[PDB]
Design an enzyme around this catalytic site. Structure first.
Site, PDB file in Angstrom:
ATOM      1  N   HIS A  54       0.821  -1.204   0.000  1.00 43.03           N
ATOM      2  CA  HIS A  54       0.000   0.000   0.000  1.00 43.03           C
ATOM      3  C   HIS A  54       0.857   1.257   0.000  1.00 43.03           C
ATOM      4  O   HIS A  54       0.466   2.279  -0.577  1.00 43.03           O
ATOM      5  CB  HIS A  54      -0.983  -0.018   1.182  1.00 43.03           C
ATOM      6  CG  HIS A  54      -0.368   0.253   2.525  1.00 43.03           C
ATOM      7  ND1 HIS A  54      -0.236  -0.722   3.493  1.00 43.03           N
ATOM      8  CD2 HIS A  54       0.097   1.399   3.082  1.00 43.03           C
ATOM      9  CE1 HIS A  54       0.301  -0.194   4.581  1.00 43.03           C
ATOM     10  NE2 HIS A  54       0.516   1.091   4.355  1.00 43.03           N
ATOM     11  N   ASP A 105      -0.162  -7.463   1.231  1.00 44.65           N
ATOM     12  CA  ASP A 105       0.404  -6.123   1.458  1.00 44.65           C
ATOM     13  C   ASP A 105       1.942  -6.130   1.539  1.00 44.65           C
ATOM     14  O   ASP A 105       2.555  -5.609   2.472  1.00 44.65           O
ATOM     15  CB  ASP A 105      -0.223  -5.487   2.704  1.00 44.65           C
ATOM     16  CG  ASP A 105      -0.065  -3.987   2.729  1.00 44.65           C
ATOM     17  OD1 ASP A 105       0.066  -3.389   1.644  1.00 44.65           O
ATOM     18  OD2 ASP A 105      -0.079  -3.395   3.826  1.00 44.65           O
ATOM     19  N   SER A 112       4.572   1.190   9.397  1.00 52.86           N
ATOM     20  CA  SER A 112       4.120   0.001   8.691  1.00 52.86           C
ATOM     21  C   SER A 112       5.070  -0.254   7.525  1.00 52.86           C
ATOM     22  O   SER A 112       5.555   0.681   6.882  1.00 52.86           O
ATOM     23  CB  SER A 112       2.669   0.150   8.214  1.00 52.86           C
ATOM     24  OG  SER A 112       2.613   0.736   6.934  1.00 52.86           O
TER      25      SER A 112
END
EC number: 3.4.21.-
Lengths: 455, 465, 455, 465
Positions: free
Chosen positions: B47, B78, B156
């Site tokens: 992402h 992801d 992240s």
């Protein structure tokens, strides 16, 4: 001053309400009392709000300056217009009261007076205001807005114009008056049918006819105006006579425009459904349509709308049926609101929302039946988490309504009971031990019987 | 000890506008974390790098930003796999090294960068549970680690370490938890290994397979008995099978799945996982590769049957994402026809699209299965107002179901019927029992000037030309 | 009561707007609708606000009590006065409407009535108030303030005095009325030039002449009054005839004081620019100056102001030119506001702010050209962070405007393209591979062509 | 172990009023931190002691305040060097001892005092990055340490220690970070050593040299090729050279700087710094001393040239500070003429003067170079209202560009032209195409009574007499 001669006609309304529990349809909730106002009209009758006696188990009326609270009878409740009609059997309640006299529809900014009783008081209160607006709102109906104070206890009492004459029913800083045309329709509806029935509908959905190619493709000449029928309620009379894609041109000779409006007053139009709502259940009406490019005119006897998920159930108790702790009931708006709260139109399961917003009843007895919940017990281990899920079939046969399901369960002789549920789920129970388990589950939950009386 | 390998990711994005599918939104740059692994490779979140037109990497001690290359994108897990041609980036960094799947309550340390900062940040926590979850909403559910820490953008895409300094996966900011809840996720090493091994074998990402079935628990004893299950047997009943999955040709509704690749499935759909630990049986399916086969044992009409089923990725009617491709659309007479996907619904109705979108569309999002390989939900997105479409200007996100009497299967189907329409009129059947009627010849002739008005380069997306 | 005879002349205004994106000038933004009011005047015309039809792609008008929304044509938009002029080609829209009649300029505290349509309603609304103030505000113009409610949908409809007569155009608790002199100038401007042109200016900057030594040093006798010219716009007619340090004494025989004011009413003065703004583009005006101690009088034909950074672009699309992903555009106020938001006058780059506040166009075609942004691609590695930076030269030659730059790029035959940018930066690109790279970059960003149609 | 050496600094300040340059503001006392080092010396921030008329030092365990002597002030590096004649102050304190330049993430402990308190405070953090930054806004950028801790007045000026108890520099409260951001700075030991060694050699502070150039990155390959750069070459292009720097006589615009003192400069202006670390090439310049020479290698017209350039301090048109000197001013007929500096703009327009000052002045602050050694931006600051200046009372902070037809170069130039003016009139050309005209004889005669009215001791600052 000019209202004084009618103040003796304004009564205090004491009501004890016992509401059903739609989530636990075998229960009635705790009694509570409310106080309201009301007023005497011709013919041994009293008007007040529908919400003043909603779910009444006792209604009492106390005349002005009277020491006595007389037991009243509710003659009729009109949910859509927030009107109730009361009488009192006792002759001394009526002895020598001069009833209220009605007046003409006021204009805006006219002086208006609401007469009633404050909560906790037996003495008449009198509030003054002017008509803020006049709006066809909420079946949509005429309703006056006023800049004034409806003291909650005051709701149900009369509004008066700056003569002595009644302009409607106040109901609960601004307030609303239910106007005299609405009241007139309610009274005349009650007199026509010896009950309340409501405001009829044409059970059709329609689409505007404004685009030139759409109009030309269906044979509408440039002078013709109307709306195209999308769908017709299968349970409405019209379904035998009107057809999808008919263009409705006029209703009782009133020309309907391409946007669905009809003339109202100079400079003002309104939806044609407003015209239909001033008819009475059982009236006939002339509907003129364009069909396959030909003009047809039908005489149609108007009826009340049958909703798949009923908006209310008219003070009737909710129904339910239980076997082996599976609680079956029907989906209605009071059920959805009791299950999911004020925002049920967003929080309820999408499957039920689709039916609520878009489904039509395919027969007059069709109900949307759900497993409401499962009262946990050994017999139903592994099914406890089923909540508000439609039942579509029982041992291979379609479920049309709650009474239908209950009869099928009662007469079931197969070894197993097999319920097809929504989301492609099945429930299977041993028929003998499921019927044997029910009674103990009813005892544990204090349920008076496996089903409501109407089944 | 490992922190030199923890890089800042700078990405330039050029996103499609799903509401205005002929546009791309303004270029913008975002920062996130990633880390260096073995083989001249960098890992980050998919992402962080979606709709990339340029990706750069910055190490913590040097001003220099290095041009990176995107090797593969795994949207479902992801994960993005990057590399960097400039060798000055790689020199003198010890790559991160991976550890075994952590136990519950094991300590984890997540290394990254704050939003907007280029200084290292360090968050600590415990592995609080195993989980099967979607990393993209509505997408295939995969093994994941729930951790006690907090993950927010910036970090992240940074690595999570066990107390022995080994990496146990990639930090992932929760989609369903408010940042104050101190709840985040780690994409674990068996998912990373699946992604990397997948790319290494096939020179591209090939996804995560599914079985393509919905199932119902078999915990009620009457249910089990009525279906012939012996007392030692356990498993789950098949509610419905995706018509577009190959296994819709061998499995049947109301089969009871007993085992998968020899692993015994319980009545609640769980399989043994480790000592004292049980997990949903889908983890056996998602750890396989697309095209692998699986032994499925079922009870059908009280008899045991065994199938070897070739597994494919899930095809959703309303797709969770469209793989960074441009959204398709087609315009005639100002009517904008497009397909419904989750990005479309998010673009139209906001983050709460599961409550605020039309119930008709929500129904199909939550419950409809594609009935065929190329089926799409086609809508009139909007009407670009002009004289040709007077009376229709307010049509919004309404499904098209037929064109001149023929079912609409997908956008290219509809585009073809419009272009080959020889009838006097074009008649579109829309949802809510509405029809749209246009004169064919003038409708086609009106299109050009409308495109000019809204600066639309072409009446259709390239995939329809 | 007295306004009723004109209520049939007040129309509801439906508009679909499609705004250009000034930051991405190849894009148009998403359609949106607004509702407003308007009213019929003599000569098959309708007045409403400029903001009611700003960036219109469709305008419809609905007469009072009418069932039909007629397509309208916009005849003229006057941005500076917030007025638009509409007509309807269809004769039945005009059949038998009595247009509005205008009245005299009211005083303060006079009773005024605004008539229009609420948002979401087709029924006339009527708001009452008094004129709070009267102020030359915002080109500065007369504008009335009222203590009342302009219901947003009400904006565009007429204001009436306590006779039956129209006092102006309401626009959106207090509200404003655009007064009749302003409307008069707009109408007469449109009739003179078959379009809107605006309110002319003397393109001069001036300094007060109040200090005695300053006055004496320039030969002003004690009875003379006026203002000293600081600078003159090179693109204005006046530049051929007036000179820096001329003292302007009078305009059309109106004496200009040392502070730049002229008489207005008893006890009130106003700036002399107000006098100029009541002329019309193309009028002549007599400007009397003191130059080198002699009185000179010039006949000057008035023109519209040419701003280097235009305050708006009159509904025209923004221009752009792209090569190798370098987006070039011109600086205007809508661009600055779209790039830097409401506070652009503080957040924009100081280089552009200087030009915005202080620079004059040196020729009629001069534009301030910037690299707006760089759409990143291999061809432009190392340049990605250039944002809103002026381009001053291309391969040695000055850049005068966007069309000039585009022609130079198109006709470039040198091996390299060399852009001198502000802050002493250069951009160098291989000419052949830069032209070859463009098309793929346009595809990636969905740009219909390398340049806007006007180039 | 070291905390006895950490002293409280009490300073009496008598600040010039830049808005009213004939005044000094009320005496006031401030507290801050400092620490004892070797050689009977104390270090603190320059800013803690600016415009000092008295400095005292207090150790933590004794009520007694000792009169200190200011030896040297380094405004650019924000360091003051103090000593104390009373030996009772020095007896029994172990001086602080300095450690090597810390590595990233190394622990740092900052020892000082809170605002208003005389108790020791101790803040801890990590070295989060190297940085080249201005310690005074608009001034020369120097090596600095960014730390995870928070520095607020009181403690800036206290020592920062590594985990081995050695001092790695002087705490510095960030100018661009809100105190809650937990971000502060440490003036590192090579900057301290530069300051002390500078004073030790020259008996005074001599500053930090600059090269006097602006530069543009050479990362585009077409740019590099068009300028003749071989494929192995890298460096930065000279955009513009300060006319007042000596090197404006040997370097040229569009030279490409390849190396500095043999250190290879990359296309982004960075040089290698340590293992895995790169920093801007200016750190090679600022670690030299004023008057040192430097080998600069450039590419000019596709040929390599090498210059040895004598380095000087930077002269800014609008100075970052004026070295604690009084601001110059000059008055005639109530017109107050002064020069524009950063303190002037701060005094006039507040802390946000980069947004609220006139754009004309901001332009020159951000972008103008002095065209000559003594150039100054001269403004009419204000007009002291009187009959002689009727009509001009509202002139505020407006540049003066000419006097009776001659350019104004600086304040002393203008002061001289006014005093020697023999013409009937004085004609000042001001910015925004304005003129001020005064009768010479009466203007001079009006000045005295105006000064009396505002209690102005003299028509001019001493530097103009």
């Amino acid at each position: 001053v000019k209202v004084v001669p009618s103040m003796d006609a304004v009564v205090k309304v004491f009501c004890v309400h016992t509401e059903p529990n739609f989530s636990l349809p075998w229960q009635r909730k705790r009694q509570y009392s409310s106080g309201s106002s009301g007023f005497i009209i011709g013919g041994r009758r009293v008007l007040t709000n529908a919400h003043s006696v909603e779910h009444h188990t006792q209604v009492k009326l106390k005349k002005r300056g009277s020491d006595t609270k007389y037991l009243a009878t509710v003659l009729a409740i009109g949910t859509e217009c927030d009107i109730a009609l009361l009488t009192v059997t006792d002759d001394e309640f009526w002895e020598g009261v001069s009833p209220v006299e009605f007046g003409d529809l006021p204009a805006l900014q006219d002086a208006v007076t609401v007469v009633g009783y404050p909560i906790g008081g037996d003495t008449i209160s009198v509030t003054s205001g002017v008509v803020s607006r006049m709006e066809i709102l909420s079946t949509e109906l005429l309703g006056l807005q006023i800049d004034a104070a409806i003291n909650s206890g005051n709701s149900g009492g009369p509004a008066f114009n700056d003569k002595g004459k009644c302009v409607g029913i106040a109901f609960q800083n601004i307030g609303y008056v239910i106007p005299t045309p609405v009241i007139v329709h309610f009274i005349q509806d009650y007199e026509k049918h010896d009950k309340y029935t409501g405001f009829p509908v044409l059970g059709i959905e329609w689409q505007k006819m404004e685009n030139p190619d759409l109009r030309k493709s269906m044979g509408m000449e440039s002078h013709q105006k109307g709306v195209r029928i999308r769908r017709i309620e299968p349970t409405a009379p019209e379904s035998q006579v009107l057809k999808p894609s008919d263009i409705i041109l006029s209703f009782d000779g009133v020309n309907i425009a391409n946007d669905g409006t009809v003339p109202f007053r100079h400079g003002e139009r309104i939806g044609f459904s407003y015209l239909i709502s001033q008819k009475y259940t059982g009236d006939s009406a002339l509907v003129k349509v364009l069909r396959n490019k030909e003009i047809l005119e039908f005489n149609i006897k108007l009826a009340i709308h049958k909703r798949l998920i009923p908006a209310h159930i008219s003070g009737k108790p909710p129904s339910y049926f239980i076997v082996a702790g599976f609680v079956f009931t029907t989906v209605s708006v009071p059920y959805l609101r009791s299950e999911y709260g004020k925002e049920y139109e967003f929080d309820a399961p999408v499957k039920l929302l689709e039916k609520h917003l878009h489904a039509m009843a395919q027969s007059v007895d069709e109900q949307l039946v759900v497993v409401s919940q499962v009262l946990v017990s050994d017999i139903n281990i592994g099914y406890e988490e089923i909540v508000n899920t439609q039942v579509v079939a029982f041992n291979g046969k379609p479920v049309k309504n709650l009474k239908g399901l209950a009869g099928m369960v009662e007469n079931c002789e197969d070894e197993y009971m097999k319920f097809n549920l929504d989301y492609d789920q099945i429930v299977v129970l041993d028929t003998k031990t499921a019927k044997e388990a029910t009674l103990d589950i009813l005892t544990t939950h204090c349920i008076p019987s496996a089903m409501s009386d109407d089944l």
